[PDB]
Symmetry: C3
Amino acid sequence: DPDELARRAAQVIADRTGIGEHDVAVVLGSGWLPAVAALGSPTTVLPQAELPGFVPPTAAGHAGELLSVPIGAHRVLVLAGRIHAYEGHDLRYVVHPVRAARAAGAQIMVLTNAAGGLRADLQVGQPVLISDHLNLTARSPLVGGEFVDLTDAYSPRLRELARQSDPQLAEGVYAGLPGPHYETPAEIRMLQTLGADLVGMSTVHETIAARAAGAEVLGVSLVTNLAAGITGEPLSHAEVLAAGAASATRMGALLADVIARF
Amino acid sequence: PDPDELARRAAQVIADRTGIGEHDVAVVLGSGWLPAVAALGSPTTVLPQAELPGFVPPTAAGHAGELLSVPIGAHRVLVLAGRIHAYEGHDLRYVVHPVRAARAAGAQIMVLTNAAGGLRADLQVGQPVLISDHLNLTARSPLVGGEFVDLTDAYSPRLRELARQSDPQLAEGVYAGLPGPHYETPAEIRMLQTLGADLVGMSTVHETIAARAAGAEVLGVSLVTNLAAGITGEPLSHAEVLAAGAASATRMGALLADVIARF
Amino acid sequence: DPRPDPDELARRAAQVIADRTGIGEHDVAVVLGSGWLPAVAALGSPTTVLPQAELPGFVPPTAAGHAGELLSVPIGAHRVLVLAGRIHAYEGHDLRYVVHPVRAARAAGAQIMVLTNAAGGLRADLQVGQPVLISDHLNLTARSPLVGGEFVDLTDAYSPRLRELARQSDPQLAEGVYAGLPGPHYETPAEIRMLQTLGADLVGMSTVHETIAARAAGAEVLGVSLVTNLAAGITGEPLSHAEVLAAGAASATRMGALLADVIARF
Ligand SMILES: O=c1[nH]cnc2cc[nH]c12
Ligand SMILES: O=c1[nH]cnc2cc[nH]c12
Ligand SMILES: O=c1[nH]cnc2cc[nH]c12
Ligand SMILES: OC[C@H]1NC[C@H](O)[C@@H]1O
């Protein structure tokens, strides 16, 4: 039962942070990890591996951390380092952070990710709010039949608050694929025809579990490269890494400023 | 252990318990269709699915539905009131087992029904729609190994013709089968329109494939319980979806009975 | 972490292959598509033939029966590994088994993989019996044979250079985008219209994972489809494996002769 496990995690977080409950959670994906320090200095820093349900028993190594950071008047749970579906782990582990945070009282989830840009106006290094998504993984983190509507899965209200911080923020449709491989140029032309503006390898399941758990969602992509076949040249791993490293401080500041308005 | 073997074993229990050697037609009632049972016709036999070989997975449980034996016209029909979807996490063998068991019990025609969101402009809530073809978007198949089944005319034009003889105004449409259990985003719905879908659901495709692989004809019927996500400008309503299925239950059952009678 | 380890198994299979064939390393590997079996002879006289069942990592423990063979064939100045028989994802086994032949071949020295298949034709000009080079693909399986975070760019996954060489062999060769679906069932007419909208010219039940694994392992790939039928709904006639096998046998000698002449130019 994912619910009872998130419940236990929430209890551990409360006792380890001294904070009765948190209000917001932020998931830092690829291209957003170096922006952690910019969100604010943490009051508590604890390894995900020491928290119930975060890391699967078999496969291991060293998970990220879970930070408790005060931002504005909020107590924010910051997840630095997520476990991906491409490793083969059940999706309950992928969405556990969201479920635990909700159990911890978090009602807003800020989900970030690295993404390839498909719409012509999007540039490398540009953060883009997610207006909607295309779940192209043929999976779901939900088991059983509860009713879960995904209309406005990415709260228009929260996107409006984000624009108070930066009125020029672009908005677009994110396509979530299984990965880990990047797409062929043919696949990118396909995604374009399907209405995708951004392409990535995460986030969709977290959004679904979030909405199912009663939380609002703000998604933010960092365009780390133009999608395959667009430039006429192969992708550059170096560029993808630099996109995240360079905008680190700027991205951390933006998120803190936005979250403060929540 | 074997899928076909379990189907045969199930057919045997069905035969003995219903007192009917073979059933000519099988009906799988989808979400929202349950209350149509009475209008379909009173059963002569009712047996718990949990008491039939192969119907329930080992681990996850609780209590499955019922299997009905109903005389309709000059036919003996197996009516499955309660199914298990792929989104429930079980191997597809359990999802299509009712179809294979029905075939083993003699069913040559499978009538597969379901609840679906409507994408084509002319479709209205409460409208039954004949499935003309499907888009299997689950990235899966209930077939394992080299079972290369042709899916041209998967939904018998013959049976669709008979259905129209019952109601000449019945519309047809392409059904998009997704994994579920979450409903779609407006963007996903726009994507489905581009791909040629008229209806969107969370079942049926695997049942259709298994039916065809087993050599049975298929009539597909969707009940539009809501307009697809992003079309009304308002969020989907669980209350309204459920209200829609109950509201058209009697009408759906009566429709099914008249069409089947023509087989 | 996962046991067995893909790369360890590939290297061990390479060693077995080297000892059994008496050849230290091979230069090219050919994976034969379904229906293409009778084309093996056309490729050339084998110096070594061995059961795939006698090679580590090729056959899953549970499900069995009898796998194909692996042949060592000299083609031009090349020592070529020919895989007559393979396993597809629809058989239900981990993709590790689907791409192991490619990984084993690379570990054996092959830096060029020639992946062949039977496909339904969707683009109007492609005809039954026509060999088509694969220019790109659409992986519609929602899976990947990769489980690590390594950066893998699929741009030019099907080497433009190799397609250039294939055309020096046959300047008439057409090219097309191949859509790989899970199978084993064939497509409905509606799904075929959908694939056409997505940009697919050919449709099949293999190849995509092999290509991805090959690119990840550092090998170039030349993809070759044999149109064995027009995709569902085009002719209004139902498809059949028999039909596919028929086209495969009918073009066997021509396909093998073509592969041989193209590989000779590598
Ligand atoms: O181009 C891309 N495709 C898929 N995922 C990512 C993540 C960053 N860039 C990309
Ligand atoms: O809108 C819908 N989407 C997917 N499945 C169903 C089943 C009933 N309505 C819907
Ligand atoms: O039409 C087809 N669809 C899928 N696979 C194949 C393989 C040969 N022909 C086809
Ligand atoms: O006839 C169908 C088979 N041939 C090619 C497909 O991949 C499948 O294995």
